[PDB]
Scaffold this motif. Structure first.
Motif, PDB file in Angstrom:
ATOM      1  N   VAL A  13       0.833  -1.200   0.000  1.00 28.87           N
ATOM      2  CA  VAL A  13       0.000   0.000   0.000  1.00 28.87           C
ATOM      3  C   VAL A  13       0.869   1.252   0.000  1.00 28.87           C
ATOM      4  CG1 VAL A  13      -1.578   1.360   1.408  1.00 28.87           C
ATOM      5  CG2 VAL A  13      -2.062  -1.058   0.974  1.00 28.87           C
ATOM      6  N   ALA A  14       1.858   1.304   0.896  1.00 27.92           N
ATOM      7  CA  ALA A  14       2.715   2.483   0.988  1.00 27.92           C
ATOM      8  C   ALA A  14       3.471   2.720  -0.314  1.00 27.92           C
ATOM      9  CB  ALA A  14       3.688   2.335   2.158  1.00 27.92           C
ATOM     10  N   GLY A  86      -7.880  -8.690   3.377  1.00 28.36           N
ATOM     11  CA  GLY A  86      -7.508  -9.590   4.456  1.00 28.36           C
ATOM     12  C   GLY A  86      -6.551 -10.693   4.052  1.00 28.36           C
ATOM     13  N   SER A  87      -6.455 -10.989   2.759  1.00 26.53           N
ATOM     14  CA  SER A  87      -5.560 -12.023   2.257  1.00 26.53           C
ATOM     15  C   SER A  87      -4.162 -11.507   1.951  1.00 26.53           C
ATOM     16  CB  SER A  87      -6.152 -12.661   0.998  1.00 26.53           C
ATOM     17  OG  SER A  87      -7.361 -13.328   1.304  1.00 26.53           O
ATOM     18  N   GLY A  88      -3.932 -10.201   2.064  1.00 33.17           N
ATOM     19  CA  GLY A  88      -2.639  -9.629   1.768  1.00 33.17           C
ATOM     20  C   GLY A  88      -2.478  -9.098   0.362  1.00 33.17           C
ATOM     21  N   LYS A  89      -3.509  -9.192  -0.471  1.00 30.65           N
ATOM     22  CA  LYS A  89      -3.446  -8.629  -1.811  1.00 30.65           C
ATOM     23  C   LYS A  89      -3.738  -7.135  -1.762  1.00 30.65           C
ATOM     24  CE  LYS A  89      -4.121 -10.569  -6.186  1.00 30.65           C
ATOM     25  NZ  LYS A  89      -3.016 -11.395  -5.618  1.00 30.65           N
ATOM     26  N   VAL A  90      -3.009  -6.374  -2.574  1.00 27.94           N
ATOM     27  CA  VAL A  90      -3.098  -4.919  -2.600  1.00 27.94           C
ATOM     28  C   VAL A  90      -3.847  -4.497  -3.856  1.00 27.94           C
ATOM     29  CG1 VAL A  90      -1.802  -2.760  -2.725  1.00 27.94           C
ATOM     30  CG2 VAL A  90      -1.028  -4.603  -1.215  1.00 27.94           C
ATOM     31  N   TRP A  91      -4.800  -3.585  -3.690  1.00 23.70           N
ATOM     32  CA  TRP A  91      -5.602  -3.058  -4.779  1.00 23.70           C
ATOM     33  C   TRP A  91      -5.418  -1.548  -4.876  1.00 23.70           C
ATOM     34  CZ3 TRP A  91      -7.952  -6.874  -7.548  1.00 23.70           C
ATOM     35  CH2 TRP A  91      -8.142  -8.102  -6.902  1.00 23.70           C
ATOM     36  N   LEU A  92      -5.686  -1.017  -6.068  1.00 24.41           N
ATOM     37  CA  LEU A  92      -5.652   0.419  -6.326  1.00 24.41           C
ATOM     38  C   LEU A  92      -6.948   0.803  -7.021  1.00 24.41           C
ATOM     39  CD1 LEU A  92      -4.187   3.119  -6.246  1.00 24.41           C
ATOM     40  CD2 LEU A  92      -3.039   2.509  -8.384  1.00 24.41           C
ATOM     41  N   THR A  93      -7.706   1.710  -6.410  1.00 28.25           N
ATOM     42  CA  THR A  93      -9.049   2.057  -6.859  1.00 28.25           C
ATOM     43  C   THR A  93      -9.124   3.544  -7.175  1.00 28.25           C
ATOM     44  OG1 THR A  93     -10.038   0.281  -5.554  1.00 28.25           O
ATOM     45  CG2 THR A  93     -11.484   2.097  -6.223  1.00 28.25           C
ATOM     46  N   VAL A  94      -9.687   3.875  -8.342  1.00 26.04           N
ATOM     47  CA  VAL A  94      -9.855   5.256  -8.781  1.00 26.04           C
ATOM     48  C   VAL A  94     -11.221   5.408  -9.439  1.00 26.04           C
ATOM     49  CG1 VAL A  94      -7.378   5.623  -9.124  1.00 26.04           C
ATOM     50  CG2 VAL A  94      -8.801   4.843 -11.036  1.00 26.04           C
ATOM     51  N   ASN A  95     -11.645   6.661  -9.597  1.00 31.27           N
ATOM     52  CA  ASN A  95     -12.857   6.959 -10.350  1.00 31.27           C
ATOM     53  C   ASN A  95     -12.580   6.912 -11.845  1.00 31.27           C
ATOM     54  OD1 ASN A  95     -14.925   7.771  -8.239  1.00 31.27           O
ATOM     55  ND2 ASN A  95     -13.292   9.233  -7.754  1.00 31.27           N
ATOM     56  N   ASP A  96     -13.521   6.348 -12.588  1.00 30.88           N
ATOM     57  CA  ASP A  96     -13.522   6.499 -14.035  1.00 30.88           C
ATOM     58  C   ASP A  96     -13.875   7.946 -14.355  1.00 30.88           C
ATOM     59  OD1 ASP A  96     -13.851   6.454 -16.787  1.00 30.88           O
ATOM     60  OD2 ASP A  96     -15.090   4.648 -16.804  1.00 30.88           O
ATOM     61  N   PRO A  97     -12.974   8.719 -14.969  1.00 28.90           N
ATOM     62  CA  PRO A  97     -13.295  10.125 -15.268  1.00 28.90           C
ATOM     63  C   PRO A  97     -14.528  10.301 -16.141  1.00 28.90           C
ATOM     64  CG  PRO A  97     -10.943   9.717 -15.495  1.00 28.90           C
ATOM     65  CD  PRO A  97     -11.590   8.376 -15.339  1.00 28.90           C
ATOM     66  N   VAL A 124      -1.004   7.129 -14.448  1.00 35.26           N
ATOM     67  CA  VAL A 124      -0.585   7.040 -13.052  1.00 35.26           C
ATOM     68  C   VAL A 124      -0.971   5.690 -12.460  1.00 35.26           C
ATOM     69  CG1 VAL A 124      -0.949   8.007 -10.761  1.00 35.26           C
ATOM     70  CG2 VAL A 124      -0.583   9.528 -12.705  1.00 35.26           C
ATOM     71  N   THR A 125      -2.174   5.204 -12.777  1.00 40.90           N
ATOM     72  CA  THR A 125      -2.643   3.942 -12.213  1.00 40.90           C
ATOM     73  C   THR A 125      -1.825   2.764 -12.732  1.00 40.90           C
ATOM     74  OG1 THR A 125      -4.885   4.785 -11.887  1.00 40.90           O
ATOM     75  CG2 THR A 125      -4.615   2.394 -12.041  1.00 40.90           C
ATOM     76  N   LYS A 126      -1.577   2.720 -14.044  1.00 37.35           N
ATOM     77  CA  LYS A 126      -0.803   1.619 -14.610  1.00 37.35           C
ATOM     78  C   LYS A 126       0.619   1.605 -14.063  1.00 37.35           C
ATOM     79  CE  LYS A 126      -3.518   2.224 -18.785  1.00 37.35           C
ATOM     80  NZ  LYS A 126      -3.493   2.868 -20.130  1.00 37.35           N
ATOM     81  N   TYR A 127       1.243   2.778 -13.949  1.00 39.51           N
ATOM     82  CA  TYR A 127       2.603   2.839 -13.423  1.00 39.51           C
ATOM     83  C   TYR A 127       2.648   2.402 -11.965  1.00 39.51           C
ATOM     84  CZ  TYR A 127       6.917   4.786 -11.553  1.00 39.51           C
ATOM     85  OH  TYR A 127       8.120   4.955 -10.906  1.00 39.51           O
ATOM     86  N   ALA A 128       1.743   2.938 -11.144  1.00 39.70           N
ATOM     87  CA  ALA A 128       1.797   2.678  -9.711  1.00 39.70           C
ATOM     88  C   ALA A 128       1.494   1.224  -9.380  1.00 39.70           C
ATOM     89  CB  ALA A 128       0.826   3.597  -8.976  1.00 39.70           C
ATOM     90  N   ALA A 129       0.624   0.581 -10.156  1.00 40.54           N
ATOM     91  CA  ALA A 129       0.234  -0.794  -9.875  1.00 40.54           C
ATOM     92  C   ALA A 129       1.159  -1.818 -10.515  1.00 40.54           C
ATOM     93  CB  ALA A 129      -1.202  -1.045 -10.345  1.00 40.54           C
ATOM     94  N   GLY A 130       1.814  -1.473 -11.626  1.00 39.03           N
ATOM     95  CA  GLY A 130       2.694  -2.396 -12.310  1.00 39.03           C
ATOM     96  C   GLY A 130       4.140  -2.273 -11.857  1.00 39.03           C
ATOM     97  N   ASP A 131       4.988  -3.093 -12.471  1.00 37.86           N
ATOM     98  CA  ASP A 131       6.419  -3.077 -12.184  1.00 37.86           C
ATOM     99  C   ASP A 131       7.161  -2.196 -13.181  1.00 37.86           C
ATOM    100  OD1 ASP A 131       6.822  -4.611  -9.833  1.00 37.86           O
ATOM    101  OD2 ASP A 131       6.514  -6.468 -10.958  1.00 37.86           O
TER     102      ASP A 131
END
Ligand SMILES: [F-]
Ligand SMILES: [F-]
Lengths: 131, 133, 131, 131
Positions: A13-14, A86-97, A124-131
């Protein structure tokens, strides 16, 4: 449709939030604030896994949107939520503009600005969530 | 004035004073104020025109945590947001989210009904005081 | 005798601040805000290399200090400045808490809280500046 | 030698004194960066502290000039102001002496105009807020 766009992240998350900030800044967007929902939960005596909100945006683009319909300023600047389930998976959620444009009934004068917000949110979303 | 979960009322105060009244009423009810975003000032720094327009973010973490324990995505739309803005004719408006609408958007369950009603109460009380006299 | 503590950082300005935040949170401290001085210089049309301030602290500890002399609340929460010089070297600058204790004339009732602040500032700085 | 602390009595509550700081500062073109409720952090810590609030504000154009002279003054910028209530109910407003900050960071003669602007900005805001 809810207009919520949620993708899985390859980072904690951080680190996901810092990747949002780093990429938003490099594209000339300002970072307004971060709200650590997880830390607020811990001080209320309640349990919540890591959960962080970041608020960012380009005021040049956001102003054109608000000049069309001022109420969209309620949902601006752009918000992004990184959270661990709760399973340790990290998600990133944004509004559809596009969904946001529909919510405030934006018109043609906002067209270029909406596509800019679409491109900015996606990059921003693709960069932050991907490698 | 309601549409798509947006609730707008006319304010009897300036944009600045309306935001001050939001903060004061929220703090008196034990809520915290998280940040303020001066959209008007951002427009000036960009070289664009925009009448006074200010967002304020506030809320009670005990209530909000219960909502996020149900569906975490509502953390995207929390804390509570209020927008005070002046139109071209000099009138000042206060716009907030309908909390029950935000509950539908994130598909909150029965276990959140008490917290949703509390959010409706907090939103309506802050809005009535801030826009009123 | 400025009370300024400045050490070389092994990381960029952005990364050094991220490590301050992560270390502070893991020690139970809250992060209050971040000020991007370098971005503020760019908005004003002036030149400045990367420069960022972060504000963090433990309210339990800070309250004890303010129960002694309230004016120390002007200099709390803990502030840290990451900045890059003209050669590309990154520095991390913080206040010496003992110096802050002198500035506000703190007494014996603050001794445990000053030591805790010394330990917190020292641990966060060495982690963020070190690899 | 000196502390660099200027404390004046205010005719308003802590909350109102802070809001008057924000209002006067923003009317002069300064930004408000954040507010820190020291009193709320005390109650969340389970400790007793009367109302105490810090606000952080300033002119980033004038701050940039100072930081172009000595970057470490960015640790003590933007301008800070502390409104606090004592045990008898009196409210005080405490700020830094800008000339004392210039001494602390060894600012040169090229910053003298920018230091004077900070003096004017600090004094003007404080007189309005407490008066
Ligand atoms: F601390
Ligand atoms: F300033």
């Amino acid at each position: 449709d809810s207009g919520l766009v949620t993708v899985e992240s390859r980072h904690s998350v951080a680190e996901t939030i810092e990747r949002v900030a780093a990429k938003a800044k490099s594209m000339g967007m300002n970072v307004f604030t971060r709200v650590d929902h997880g830390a607020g939960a811990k001080e209320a005596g309640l349990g919540l896994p890591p959960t962080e909100l970041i608020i960012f945006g380009n005021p040049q683009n956001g102003t054109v949107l608000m000049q069309d319909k001022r109420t969209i300023g309620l949902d601006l600047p752009i918000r992004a939520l990184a959270w661990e389930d709760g399973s340790g998976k990290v998600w990133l959620t944004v509004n559809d503009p596009a969904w946001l444009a529909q919510r405030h009934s934006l018109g043609l004068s906002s067209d270029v600005a909406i596509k800019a917000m679409v491109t900015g949110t996606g990059t921003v979303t693709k960069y932050a969530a991907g490698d």
